[PDB]
Design a protein around this ligand. Structure first.
Ligand SMILES: CNCc1ccc(C(=O)NC)o1
Length: 330
């Protein structure tokens, strides 16, 4: 089997991407944030505290003839941005882009933190990291990908995120029309439950490539690119008037600037992030200070190849017995 679904930016900055997901019978379609940095499929629901719902589409398990309470199961998750959610669990039929899993754990939110309530565009998350990170207790549950894997033509999914444009998530096949040149594959460690890999280095604009190992995670659920402070300082030093602002919480730059590109290594290959991808717009409406898309990972404890980096590539999440990542230009 295969599936193919379009993923669409939630706003003009590509702050996140939403993908429609069919849950239950008859189908209830929710727009979920596909997150390769977490392993829970959770939704706004008929159980969510009413004051914490503001415009989201909700899953109502009592309206699904295939929904079954997973008796005794709870979940509770805290993300790297300080957001959180928790609740109970149903199993139900979940389809993405024509690919159907029966008996998928659908984690129904009873509580969500303010950032989720305040974002009317995201109806929940679909985790695509390794199932070892799933929070359901006392019986840990599998991701949608892990449950689909055996049925797929090839045990893979791909992320093809757009810059200010829709893109695609494919499951079970590699669309050889969606990228240029060849795919370069690189080793993955699953020891922390992430798609963790080691970049071979970086360049700033037209500068020389610096060969240096950068361990990090391919994370579709993180907006920006978070890298070691040395690398980030070297990038922003090439932008007149850029500075790290403790009050704003990262590097800012004059909105009048033209940003240089950023290149990262994948083995002997190179992925170029155009400068425009690194512009996240005014810090507040009408400000001439703009927020940078490359930020320090210092304090986070891990480097994160988020959407800024991933949207410059066609990315293969290879879930073979030994997982690997693939990157192609496009
Ligand atoms: C786990 N991937 C999605 C997500 C939630 C919060 C964050 C984050 O803070 N990244 C820096 O990422």
């Amino acid at each position: 089997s295969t599936g193919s679904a379009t993923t669409t930016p939630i706003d003009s900055l590509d702050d996140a991407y939403i993908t429609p997901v069919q849950i239950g019978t008859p189908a209830q379609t929710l727009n979920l944030d596909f997150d390769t940095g977490s392993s829970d499929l959770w939704v706004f629901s008929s159980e969510t505290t009413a004051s914490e719902v503001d415009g989201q589409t909700i899953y109502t398990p009592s309206k699904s003839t295939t929904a079954k309470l997973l008796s005794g199961a709870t979940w509770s998750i805290s993300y790297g941005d300080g957001s959180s959610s928790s609740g109970d669990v149903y199993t139900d039929t979940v389809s993405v882009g024509g690919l159907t899993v029966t008996g998928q754990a659908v984690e129904s939110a009873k509580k969500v933190s303010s950032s989720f309530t305040e974002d009317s565009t995201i109806d929940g998350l679909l985790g695509l990291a390794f199932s070892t990170l799933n929070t359901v207790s006392p019986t840990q549950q599998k991701t949608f990908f892990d449950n689909a894997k055996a049925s797929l033509d090839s045990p893979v999914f791909t992320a093809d995120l757009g810059y200010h444009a829709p893109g695609t998530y494919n499951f079970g096949f590699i669309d050889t029309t969606a990228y240029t040149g060849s795919i370069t594959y690189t080793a993955v460690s699953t020891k922390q439950g992430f798609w963790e890999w080691t970049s071979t280095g970086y360049a700033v604009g037209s500068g020389t490539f610096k060969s240096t190992s950068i361990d990090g995670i391919a994370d579709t659920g993180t907006t920006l690119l978070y890298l070691p402070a040395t690398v980030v300082s070297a990038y922003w030093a090439q932008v007149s008037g850029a500075k790290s602002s403790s009050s704003v919480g990262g590097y800012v730059f004059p909105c009048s600037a033209t940003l240089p590109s950023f290149t990262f290594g994948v083995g002997s290959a190179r992925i170029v992030i155009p400068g425009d991808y690194i512009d996240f717009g005014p810090i507040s409406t009408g400000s001439s200070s703009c927020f940078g898309g490359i930020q320090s990972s210092a304090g986070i404890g891990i480097n994160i190849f988020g959407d800024v980096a991933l949207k410059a590539a066609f990315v293969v999440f290879n879930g073979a017995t030994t997982p690997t990542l693939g990157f192609a230009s496009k």
